[PDB]
């Protein structure tokens, strides 16, 4: 494996990888890590 | 440009299985719901992008900005199985399902391979008082009192001045830390970062 990796570079065609969200005043961080990584992977594996 | 998956949809419609909405949840269960029930599109607060944009306004997470400060944890919004008006097609048609979900072994080597092969993963770590004050560099807990768990998205790794790290994205907006991202110590299960990693494969393929 390379000594460094940043998915934002490996997959520039997937804007969501660079995208940061805001959970607000709510303990939903559990759902944020999920939908973010899922948005990335949908693009990486297809569109 | 691709599909922005709705935090709202998962947070509000998962239910018991996932935990207690705005008051805590289980990421492994979240990924599992995606496989079973799927998830619709949905952008950021007030964006009108997607089927179900986030409905909780943004705020200043322990930093100073112009936005109102965050006020702990409010009410989990309800589950509305309908898309916003002005969006097509329907909610059922708008669902995106995961093929499978799985934990990733507690090996930095195994987490690294996963990201490299399949993309960014979700993990969890323990937030100490000194984490809030992060601006840049590589985070390494020194002082502070345990505050609670935090689920994030790990999207890479590297080395900054001999110090190995994980490139991690937080969900505290852009004005927190390094443009919303942060690096945290890698290879020692520091603050339990390598111990709770979960991921899955899109049904699309
Ligand atoms: C996820 C979670 O959201 N945790 C909290 C958090 O990040 N908060 C609360 C809402 C505003 C934001 C803040 O600025 O503090 C908080 C407890 C982190 C220290 C968490 O509740 C969860 O479900 O994680 C378990 C995997």
Listed by start position, the domains of chain B span 1-205
B205, B98 in Cβ contact below 8 A?
no
Cα B164 to Cα B158: distance, rounded to the nearest angstrom? 6
Q: What does the DSSP 8-state code read for residue B70?
A: P
Phi, psi torsion values for B160, nearest 5 degrees:
-120, 115
Cα B169 to Cα B145: distance, rounded to the nearest angstrom? 22
Closest CA to B124 of B176, B42, B190, B49: B190
Question: What is the token pair recorded at B172?
Answer: 């505290």
**Residues in B touching A29 (Cβ below 8 Å):** 150-152, 171
Structure resolution, Å:
2.0
Phi, psi torsion values for B2, nearest 5 degrees:
-150, 180
Cα B113 to Cα B79: distance, rounded to the nearest angstrom? 36
List the domain range (segments joined by +) for residue A12. 6-47
Cα B42 to Cα B79: distance, rounded to the nearest angstrom? 14
Best residue in B1, B11, B15, B182 to probe A by mutation, most A CBs within 10 Å? B11
Question: What is the token pair recorded at B156?
Answer: 């890479």
Cα A47 to Cα A41: distance, rounded to the nearest angstrom? 10
Cα B136 to Cα B149: distance, rounded to the nearest angstrom? 21
A44 within domain boundaries: yes
Q: How far is CA B159 from CA A3, B2, B47, B192, in A?
A: 8, 30, 36, 19
CATH code at A25?
A: 1.20.5.170
Phi, psi torsion values for B141, nearest 5 degrees:
-55, 130
Fold of B1-205: Cathepsin B; Chain A (3.90.70)
Cα B17 to Cα B32: distance, rounded to the nearest angstrom? 9
Q: Which residues contact B188 (CB under 8 A, 6 or more apart)?
A: none
Residue A26 has a CB neighbour count (10 Å cut-off) of: 25
> Three-state SS for A38?
helix
Based on C-alpha coordinates, what's the Rg of chain A? 12
Cα A1 to Cα A12: distance, rounded to the nearest angstrom? 20
Number of domains in chain A: 1
Cα B179 to Cα A4: distance, rounded to the nearest angstrom? 20
Contact B202 A45 (CB under 8 A): yes
Question: What is the token pair recorded at B83?
Answer: 């898309």
Residue A1 has a CB neighbour count (10 Å cut-off) of: 11
The verdict on the CB of residue A26 being under 6 Å from ligand 1 is: yes
Q: How far is CA B98 from CA B129, B158, B164, in A?
A: 36, 29, 32
List the Cα angle B25/B26/B28 in 5-degree steps: 155
By Cβ distance, the residue of A1, A33, A43 closest to B112 is A1
Burial B171-199 (b: 16+ CB within 10 A, else e): bbbebbbeebbbbbbbeeebbebbebbbb
A1 within domain boundaries: no
Q: How far is CA B173 from CA A32, A40, B49, B133, in A?
A: 12, 18, 18, 15
E-strand ranges in A1-47 read: 5-6
A24 within domain boundaries: yes
């Amino acid at each position: 494996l390379p000594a460094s990796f940043d998915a934002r570079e490996q997959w520039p065609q997937c804007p969501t990888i660079k995208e940061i969200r805001d959970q607000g005043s709510c303990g939903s961080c559990w759902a944020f890590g999920a939908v973010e990584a899922i948005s990335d992977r949908i693009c990486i594996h297809t569109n | 440009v691709s599909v922005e998956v709705s935090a709202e949809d998962l947070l509000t419609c998962c239910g018991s299985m996932c935990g207690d909405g705005c008051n805590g949840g289980y990421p492994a269960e979240a990924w599992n719901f995606w496989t079973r029930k799927g998830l619709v599109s949905g952008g950021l607060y007030e964006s009108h992008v997607g089927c179900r944009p986030y409905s909780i306004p943004p705020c200043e997470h322990h930093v100073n900005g112009s936005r109102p400060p965050c006020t702990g944890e409010g009410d989990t919004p309800k589950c509305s199985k309908i898309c916003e008006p002005g969006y097509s097609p329907t909610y059922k048609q708008d669902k995106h399902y995961g093929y499978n979900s799985y934990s990733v072994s507690n090996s930095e080597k195994d987490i690294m391979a996963e990201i490299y092969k399949n993309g960014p993963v979700e993990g969890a770590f323990s937030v100490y008082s000194d984490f809030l004050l992060y601006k840049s560099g590589v985070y390494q807990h020194v002082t502070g009192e345990m505050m609670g768990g935090h689920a994030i998205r790990i999207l890479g790794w590297g080395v900054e001045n001999g110090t190995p790290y994980w490139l991690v994205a937080n969900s505290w907006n852009t004005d927190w830390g390094d443009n919303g991202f942060f690096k945290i110590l890698r290879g020692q299960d520091h603050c339990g970062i390598e111990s709770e990693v979960v991921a899955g494969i899109p049904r699309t393929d």
